[PDB]
Amino acid sequence: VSSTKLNDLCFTNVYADSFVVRGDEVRQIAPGQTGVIADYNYKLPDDF
Amino acid sequence: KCVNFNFNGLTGTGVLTDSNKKFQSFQQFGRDVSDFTDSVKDPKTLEVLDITPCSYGGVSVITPGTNASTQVAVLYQDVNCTDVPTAIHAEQLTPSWRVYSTGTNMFQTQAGCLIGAEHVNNSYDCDIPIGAGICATYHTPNKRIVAYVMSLGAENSVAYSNNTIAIPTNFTISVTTEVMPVSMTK
Amino acid sequence: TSVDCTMYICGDSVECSTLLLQYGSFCTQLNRALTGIAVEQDKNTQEVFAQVKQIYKTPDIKDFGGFNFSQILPDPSKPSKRSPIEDLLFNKVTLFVKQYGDCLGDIQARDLICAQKFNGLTVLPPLLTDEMIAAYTAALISGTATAGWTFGAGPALQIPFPMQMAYRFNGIGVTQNVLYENQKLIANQFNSAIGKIQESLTSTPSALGKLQDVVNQNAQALNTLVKQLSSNFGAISSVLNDIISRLDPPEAEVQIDRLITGRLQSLQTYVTQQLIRAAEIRASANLAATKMSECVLGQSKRVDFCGKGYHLMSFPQAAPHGVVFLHVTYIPSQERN
Amino acid sequence: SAIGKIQESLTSTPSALGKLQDVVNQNAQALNTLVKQLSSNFGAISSVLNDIISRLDPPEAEVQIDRLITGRLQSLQTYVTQQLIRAAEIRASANLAATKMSECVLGQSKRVDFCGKGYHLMSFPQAAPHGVVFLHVTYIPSQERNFTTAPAICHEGKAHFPREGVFVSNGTHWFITQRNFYEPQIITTDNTFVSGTCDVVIGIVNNTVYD
Amino acid sequence: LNDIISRLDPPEAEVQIDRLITGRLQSLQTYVTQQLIRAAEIRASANLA
Amino acid sequence: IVDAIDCALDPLSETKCTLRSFIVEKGIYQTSNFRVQPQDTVVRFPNI
Ligand SMILES: *[C@@H]1O[C@H](CO)[C@@H](O[C@@H]2O[C@H](CO)[C@@H](O)[C@H](O)[C@H]2NC(C)=O)[C@H](O)[C@H]1NC(C)=O
Numbered sequence: 001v002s003s004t005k006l007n008d009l010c011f012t013n014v015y016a017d018s019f020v021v022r023g024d025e026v027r028q029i030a031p032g033q034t035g036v037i038a039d040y041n042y043k044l045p046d047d048f
Numbered sequence: 049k050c051v052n053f054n055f056n057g058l059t060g061t062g063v064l065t066d067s068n069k070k071f072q073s074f075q076q077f078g079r080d081v082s083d084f085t086d087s088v089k090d091p092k093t094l095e096v097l098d099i100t101p102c103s104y105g106g107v108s109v110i111t112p113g114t115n116a117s118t119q120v121a122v123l124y125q126d127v128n129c130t131d132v133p134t135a136i137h138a139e140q141l142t143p144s145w146r147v148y149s150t151g152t153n154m155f156q157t158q159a160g161c162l163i164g165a166e167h168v169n170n171s172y173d174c175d176i177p178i179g180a181g182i183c184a185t186y187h188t189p190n191k192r193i194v195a196y197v198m199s200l201g202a203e204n205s206v207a208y209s210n211n212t213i214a215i216p217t218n219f220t221i222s223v224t225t226e227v228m229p230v231s232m233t234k
Numbered sequence: 235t236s237v238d239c240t241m242y243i244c245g246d247s248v249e250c251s252t253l254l255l256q257y258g259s260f261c262t263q264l265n266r267a268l269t270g271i272a273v274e275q276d277k278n279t280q281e282v283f284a285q286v287k288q289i290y291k292t293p294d295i296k297d298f299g300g301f302n303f304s305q306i307l308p309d310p311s312k313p314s315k316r317s318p319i320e321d322l323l324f325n326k327v328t329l330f331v332k333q334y335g336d337c338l339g340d341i342q343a344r345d346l347i348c349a350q351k352f353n354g355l356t357v358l359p360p361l362l363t364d365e366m367i368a369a370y371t372a373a374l375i376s377g378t379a380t381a382g383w384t385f386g387a388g389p390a391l392q393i394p395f396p397m398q399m400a401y402r403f404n405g406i407g408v409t410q411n412v413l414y415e416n417q418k419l420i421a422n423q424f425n426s427a428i429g430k431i432q433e434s435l436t437s438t439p440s441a442l443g444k445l446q447d448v449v450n451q452n453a454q455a456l457n458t459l460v461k462q463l464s465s466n467f468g469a470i471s472s473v474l475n476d477i478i479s480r481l482d483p484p485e486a487e488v489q490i491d492r493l494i495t496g497r498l499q500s501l502q503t504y505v506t507q508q509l510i511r512a513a514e515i516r517a518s519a520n521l522a523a524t525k526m527s528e529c530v531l532g533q534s535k536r537v538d539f540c541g542k543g544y545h546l547m548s549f550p551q552a553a554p555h556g557v558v559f560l561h562v563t564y565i566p567s568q569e570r571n
Numbered sequence: 572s573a574i575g576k577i578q579e580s581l582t583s584t585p586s587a588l589g590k591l592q593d594v595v596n597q598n599a600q601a602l603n604t605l606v607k608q609l610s611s612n613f614g615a616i617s618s619v620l621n622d623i624i625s626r627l628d629p630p631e632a633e634v635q636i637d638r639l640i641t642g643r644l645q646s647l648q649t650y651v652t653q654q655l656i657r658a659a660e661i662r663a664s665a666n667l668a669a670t671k672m673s674e675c676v677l678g679q680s681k682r683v684d685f686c687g688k689g690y691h692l693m694s695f696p697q698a699a700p701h702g703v704v705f706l707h708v709t710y711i712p713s714q715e716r717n718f719t720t721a722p723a724i725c726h727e728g729k730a731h732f733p734r735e736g737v738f739v740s741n742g743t744h745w746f747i748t749q750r751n752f753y754e755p756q757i758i759t760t761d762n763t764f765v766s767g768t769c770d771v772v773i774g775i776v777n778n779t780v781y782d
Numbered sequence: 783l784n785d786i787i788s789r790l791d792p793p794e795a796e797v798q799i800d801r802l803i804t805g806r807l808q809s810l811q812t813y814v815t816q817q818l819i820r821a822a823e824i825r826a827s828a829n830l831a
Numbered sequence: 832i833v834d835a836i837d838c839a840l841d842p843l844s845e846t847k848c849t850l851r852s853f854i855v856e857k858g859i860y861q862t863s864n865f866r867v868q869p870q871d872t873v874v875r876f877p878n879i
């Protein structure tokens with residue numbers, strides 16, 4: 001979904017996942033990322 | 049009316065009308081085999097609305113050629129002459145189009161409503177084929193576009209009898225031309 | 235068939251229609267090809283049925299030297315000009331023609347024909363009506379009954395039907411006396427053979443399978459083209475509105491382009507298939523026109539061209555999207571060494 | 572006079588060679604459409620390959636060039652299929668023309684309406700751009716007269732049938748004539764054959780068949 | 783196909799597989815149209831025979 | 832630019848735009864829809 005279109009859209013269900021990571025590990029919170037966080041803590045689906 | 053619509057995030061262009069369709073408890077929209085959204089539940093009134101394409105009917109324009117005239121006749125396919133203004137949304141159209149939404153020259157054919165052509169009871173050879181036996185021509189009734197049932201040919205009754213024969217007493221040598229393509233550009 | 239290319243590929247989307255313009259003349263070429271096929275179909279019918287421009291009036295009596303044409307001629311005192319056999323032929327081929335409101339108030343009445351119309355797919359009516367084609371076949375048969383084979387070479391020349399049959403017999407190497415001495419037997423055999431044709435089609439279906447196959451093929455081709463709109467062709471959705479509502483122009487254009495390419499290819503496949511089928515039908519129509527000229531307007535000596543056996547005469551009967559020829563032939567039946 | 576009328580029939584009235592002009596127009600239109608398809612971008616940033624190569628590096632340029640290659644290859648593939656379809660329609664016309672050359676020019680046709688309308692006598696071929704024009708010479712009956720007729724003539728108790736032609740009565744006398752041209756000839760035992768008796772033929776008439 | 787699936791994850795592999803599907807489907811579609819054209823030329827020869 | 836056509840002006844203008852030709856020969860032409868364009872936007876979201 002494009003961020004600019006979020007204000008024009010409606011969603012059937014919305015889930016909010018919340019956690020704390022180090023600054024250099026924020027890149028791992030994205031599909032197809034490899035790293036300590038992406039591998040053993042929090043993985044997103046590739047079709048997220 | 050033809051409008052751009054946005055229902056709960058779902059956008060599109062079409063005419064919104066009252067629907068007799070019934071929706072399931074949580075259904076918000078309906079789709080057909082083509083995956084076209086044909087219906088939507090209004091999130092405020094909970095009323096089901098049909099969504100029709102802004103122009104789904106076929107429109108044919110009949111012209112005697114721009115070199116001969118700028119006059120044109122318009123055929124609305126599978127539409128009754130009474131429904132043409134609603135079918136083509138004439139109120140949202142230019143004054144120039146509204147002239148072809150109604151008029152004294154409106155003839156219903158099996159092919160649809162023809163507007164802009166004068167219907168005649170005379171039968172002629174087909175010039176511009178419209179369909180369902182109807183053809184149009186730029187005849188002089190100022191020249192005007194005229195619509196008519198096409199002629200199948202001249203009538204002839206053979207006088208059949210059990211004891212009469214017709215024998216030719218003379219003949220004519222005729223030469224006819226047959227044109228046949230043989231090759232195309234290599 | 236007629237196709238509105240923009241309504242099929244982009245529906246009412248201005249964003250998709252602007253992208254479709256980048257493909258150039260593909261849509262216009264597709265429409266020109268379908269328009270050529272539509273004109274060829276009217277030309278096919280004209281070549282087969284409109285060979286004689288003289289509409290010989292149906293004779294009041296359908297009896298000629300004992301030969302009964304009542305089953306192949308217009309019905310007496312009937313404003314429509316369809317023959318009893320033709321009435322059946324039309325009833326054996328099952329067939330679009332929906333009016334403007336027929337697709338509006340549909341409660342769970344979704345039909346493939348409405349989906350065809352809402353996606354730019356239209357069926358054009360033929361130029362010649364079924365009644366006009368029945369008038370041509372009635373004129374050809376009426377001419378044959380009275381004039382003979384002369385109305386296809388110049389002035390219609392009246393001849394008694396028995397005498398016309400005597401000429402046709404001497405054509406197949408049988409002396410005219412054989413016809414005159416056995417006139418009542420030959421007339422009875424002809425009348426019985428025409429009567430057997432009524433049931434031969436009525437009693438046994440699949441008689442008009444060649445005509446039904448043409449109708450079934452066209453229906454299947456249009457239904458396949460409509461169902462191709464549900465394919466995503468590698469896009470995130472088959473619905474243009476879902477792509478435009480969730481993505482911004484730069485990313486939406488990539489997804490819309492995948493739909494435009496797949497839908498344009500579906501339509502291009504359909505048009506090539508229709509052109510192939512159109513020539514096979516053109517070839518059948520040219521053969522039918524040749525059989526109308528040689529089997530109906532004349533007497534054929536070409537073996538197995540106008541039916542099996544020695545060809546005497548043929549009568550055309552109108553049918554949906556086609557013609558049925560009734561070939562009258564002489565067949566030797568008993569032999570002695 | 573008929574050959575002379577052919578000169579004007581084409582000269583005075585145009586559209587006589589429309590079938591040949593249509594083949595030329597179709598080919599020209601197909602080639603012009605194929606050239607104009609090069610101005611389409613097919614989803615690429617430009618229809619000009621040089622604009623893509625000059626502004627983008629190979630990895631990004633290849634994606635844009637691939638969109639042009641696919642659209643141009645499809646334009647060319649559409650053109651070739653269209654040309655093959657047109658080529659067979661012309662092959663069919665050429666095979667029919669070759670058959671008409673063999674049957675209408677090298678022979679005399681009895682096939683109705685194959686070599687022109689009327690009774691075919693002879694045909695002459697004329698060369699034309701991308702095609703052939705046949706001049707079909709035909710015999711057409713022009714004037715006709717109604718006569719009383721009979722299937723057979725009854726002499727004594729013998730049924731006489733015409734060997735060729737048909738029995739016709741001018742009003743008082745019976746004669747035999749050929750079917751396509753009125754030439755009354757006295758009924759003799761040379762222009763008739765005897766089969767059976769006068770009691771079997773319906774409509775037989777009594778007359779004198781001399782020798 | 784196996785080289786694409788073994789080296790790329792589904793989101794990136796699908797883009798490469800789609801390019802192969804489109805090219806192979808077009809190769810097969812070209813073949814079938816060619817065969818139909820040849821089939822009628824042979825049908826015409828068979829009808830003449 | 833030597834000439835121009837408003838495709839939504841009249842049926843002849845629409846025929847010219849459909850055929851992409853300023854000259855139209857004698858005949859009947861099925862035209863692409865070019866006369867109806869939405870003039871209003873309808874936005875309907877729930878009572879939240
Ligand atoms: C959302 O609220 C509107 C009112 O703002 C509701 O619609 C009104 O309902 C009342 C009571 O039935 C009617 O008298 C009004 O005519 C309605 N319209 C307006 C403009 O006031 C509407 O039903 C609500 N929707 C939902 C789903 O609760």
Ligand SMILES: *[C@@H]1O[C@H](CO)[C@@H](O[C@@H]2O[C@H](CO)[C@@H](O)[C@H](O)[C@H]2NC(C)=O)[C@H](O)[C@H]1NC(C)=O
Nearest residue numbers: 295296297298300301302303304305318425429
């Ligand atoms: C030609 O044949 C038909 C069929 O036998 C004849 O008409 C039918 O005759 C039967 C027997 O009298 C009737 O029961 C049917 O109702 C008739 N059908 C119709 C449509 O009339 C017909 O009379 C014959 N014609 C001639 C001149 O002999």
Ligand SMILES: *[C@@H]1O[C@H](CO)[C@@H](O)[C@H](O)[C@H]1NC(C)=O
Nearest residue numbers: 217218219220221713714715
């Ligand atoms: C037959 O036709 C020719 C050519 O028109 C004419 O010269 C001739 O006089 C005609 N004969 C009769 C008997 O009418």
